[PDB]
Symmetry: D2
Subunit: 319 residues, 4 copies
């Protein structure tokens, strides 16, 4: 292989630039040309595609977002859109693709592999919800964004002796909520993977202000519901000054943590390695602190777990 393409799709995550940078530098190390495909899969159709040179990735490792941009491409799922896509690839003689992003995106990449264009998938999402990896690029950075906000809310909650409900992103996964709750010492944490009881939660909360906890923080993964809901249902059964904050899209942006930069660098180079190796339809990741890769289809079946032993601990440390 002498020429490959690279793109980012799904929700952007911090560390995507560091991955792109890694795919480019690693390929050029091996005398392979790399083409930046812009706007996710929507670039395979518009043909917005450009050679990426060394100087192209020379000031991005520390930058949030993706310099290739990202976009939803239903067009590409159609046989028509798909072949417009393939035709643009052949046209530039691109032989393989590294796809960086969500689990929506791993489908486009197995499709292309079956049509002669080997693709390797790279997990980019703050949600930490891609199978085949303990960790996705942007998770760690998200966590730091969250705890930073929580730390600031604790200052005001404490000064005013108020209780706060904080909604975190995560889509359908409780990892952000679970790790950020733990890390911020939240009185309770609500996540899709583990049962909660709202009465047990009020209870823990009255028996905190009894003993003189004046303030509390409750963490709610957006995958369980709305913080503005939980906050009111709480104000009712305690008649107690409650505030809600919905952190929102800040969780997505920002210069990536050291953890995410290293992860993106390691996985991006890894991906190129397998492409240049005759492997296609694989995704890479980190499992048990070891770099692994997997047949994509084998593991799109497998369902996501948080570590329950970590949820228990959050209960034991909140009392």
């Amino acid at each position: 292989m002498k020429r490959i393409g690279v793109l980012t799709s799904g929700g952007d995550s911090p560390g995507m630039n560091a991955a792109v940078r890694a795919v480019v530098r690693k390929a050029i190390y091996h005398d392979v040309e790399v083409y930046g495909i812009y706007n996710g899969y929507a670039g395979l159709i518009s043909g917005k595609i450009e050679k990426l040179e060394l100087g192209s990735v020379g000031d991005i490792i520390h930058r949030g977002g993706t310099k290739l941009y990202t976009a939803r491409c239903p067009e590409f799922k159609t046989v028509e859109g798909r072949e417009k896509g393939i035709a643009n690839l052949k046209k530039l003689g691109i032989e393989g693709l590294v796809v960086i992003g969500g689990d929506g995106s791993y489908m486009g990449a197995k499709k292309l592999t079956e049509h002669g264009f080997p693709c390797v998938g790279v997990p980019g999402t703050i949600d930490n919800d891609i199978p085949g990896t303990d960790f996705t690029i942007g998770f760690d950075t998200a966590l730091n964004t969250v705890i930073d906000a929580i730390d600031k809310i604790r200052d005001t909650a404490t000064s005013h002796e108020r209780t706060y409900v904080i909604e975190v992103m995560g889509r359908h996964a409780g990892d952000i909520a679970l790790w950020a709750g733990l890390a911020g010492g939240a009185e309770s944490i609500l996540i899709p993977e583990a049962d909660y009881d709202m009465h047990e939660i009020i209870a823990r909360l009255k028996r905190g202000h009894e003993r003189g906890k004046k303030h509390s923080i409750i963490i709610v993964a957006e995958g369980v519901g709305s913080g503005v809901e939980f906050g009111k249902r709480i104000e009712e059964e305690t008649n107690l000054e409650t505030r809600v904050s919905v952190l929102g899209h800040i969780q997505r942006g920002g210069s990536p943590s050291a953890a995410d930069r290293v992860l993106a660098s390691r996985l991006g180079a890894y991906a190129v390695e397998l492409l240049l190796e005759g492997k296609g339809g694989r995704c890479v990741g980190i499992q048990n602190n070891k770099l692994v890769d997997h047949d994509i289809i084998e593991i799109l079946e497998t369902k996501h777990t948080v570590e329950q032993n970590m949820y228990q601990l959050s209960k034991e440390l909140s009392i």
Copy 2:
């Protein structure tokens, strides 16, 4: 004067600990005892009041919030509550008070001055809306909190070529919005002090994506209305992927900037100075980069201004 009290009321702001620390150290420098009154004016009634020693303020300069806590005291406005308050003061022989916080709080302090208890007011609020000062303690820190969030939203807005409406606090004042908009290069800024036109705003926004601005940031002071409102009214007349984020209470918390620490230190010591000087019913502040103090009643009349020359500039730099 040999014994004074100090308290924080209204919304807490970062830098309040640094002010308290300054009031305590400055008084003790002058052989004056200081008493920490907890829970704002609500402590003058409960009598939750404690001598503050040097070691009391020895690890707070960098801490957000107020270690004296703060609370609303309608009780204290009543003649009854007020005299319970006065009685607790006499009881401990506290002769004067430094009051740190909002403009609600400057009233309690003029009241006490007329009843023989000289009080000096110190501007603590992130809103920057206290007359007698160009700047209030916590403003600068708020600004940094805001631009930090904006910087993170710009990463995702840019990657996805989306337009964002960001709601900032400020109560009734546009200073947060105005300074943060400018500082983040917002396409437009909505503030109570200056007229905006929503059509002029859509216009500036179509004539941006014409020339190929894929993304925009619009800043809305909460004193003009709801970002979830503006965001939808925008989605309608552009049919264009709009997102809203309501920053919320993070703007209130967090370790204070260097600017706020210095300001709080300078004003807190200044306040003690005037108390120990036979001045009462005064507030202090910084005007034209000079430390000043003012008869409170003379200037509770005066109405708040942003700098309009700074609003113009924001228009000229957004086009």
Copy 3:
């Protein structure tokens, strides 16, 4: 067991407070009293020891440093000092210790175990150089402190087209330098575990400014030598504007990352678990993303490794 003690010794690391908080809450969860021993082992001698209550650990999870303090105790290594230590323990009926900190500290804890006081060791150091764990509490936070400083130096190095040598801590281990070099995209990285050639480094550096790299960052673990030394030996063979910066003790302080909070919470609670279990002379940690514990003596022999596959990568991505 109904009563245990906890202390921090060695160099302090961010996340030590979160570990202490976890040891306290986890033990109180199980109806076990906990005593805070201050000033490391020097507290077992002075008897500066205090019961720790729930409210004791109620505002520290996000705090850098150790609220129990830490100090070197040669005294304690002596039979005399040691038995003054033991006598204070019996005096308060403390039956076991959780020891949080460096590998110096694991010796004190095996000593106590042989003298009827079961001790469990917990890895607290930014150096990431404790055997039995892939990661030590404070490493991740150190990394972020480093990359943050690097990011700032890159700004000025880039603007002025200068080359910079940056010395990072790590004692005898290259993990900080290795991970932070990778994460910051350093042109080269000098670490004790892997050979470097200074001429190969000048070479990579001339062949960078040939192709128009105006600026470079070189990372030096303090365990290989002095940056002020490498910088000059570089200025000589290139006659090229070189700057050195020695990051220093900032790498030790600061509010811990989400990663370090979680790690410290998990390992702290884990430690209590084994103490309360009849296990002594063990240290815990995380290996292959799994919580593990080890006979201390078995593994004080084992020698530290960085991941060499990660050093290669840094070479491949710098060219």
Copy 4:
């Protein structure tokens, strides 16, 4: 005037990009072309000069450093180099310059003004040492960088009960040291503008550990001397665990504070205003919180002051 040029020289400072962005947008607002001159004055000689478009300044307001780069140009001081400079300007028909940076740089701009090329100077330096302005672009951001490092050192100094000497930049001015010392609650502050006594400093320091201050922070402007020097002379007369840290070039880099963005935006636009007005040989700034401009030569004579009333305060709050 229809065509101007803009460049940055001297030490780079955070907020220089925001100033450049402001000069460009403000001129284009008025139908005036702007040319980016690269590498400071060294670009007037090499002719490395490029038209700057709107999209040129579209993603820099939040960026540290200068995208125009900066360099020392002794060549330009020579009549020869100077006229190669002028010839490149005429060649592109550039009629005026906005010069952003140090006080070295204000000389180049008065020179050009006398040779028919009106120039306006804009204060860009972290040192806050440019006459005609209370504040220079990058100062505020420097302060925050410093206090952030101090806050981290306090964590470890406190945990270990050590005393620390911290050297800060500032060249010949004590403003960084003075403001950051105040803001960090330093035990003492050494600055060129105010006398210190080393024995008075040891004294304050023994009478601190008498009363049980276990740790202290001393701040030294690099313009008074070396921290590694003060630290040793302190270790001698106290025999007390002393540590030195030289913050270094981190103080120069990093995304600018909200304060610096606003200042740079305001002064940048202001500069263009005067150029387009027939004013030349002027520099702008902020004095008594008011935007002002000054004949350059009139005020290169005037000598720099810190506010002494602010140094006193630091003495009074440290005791």
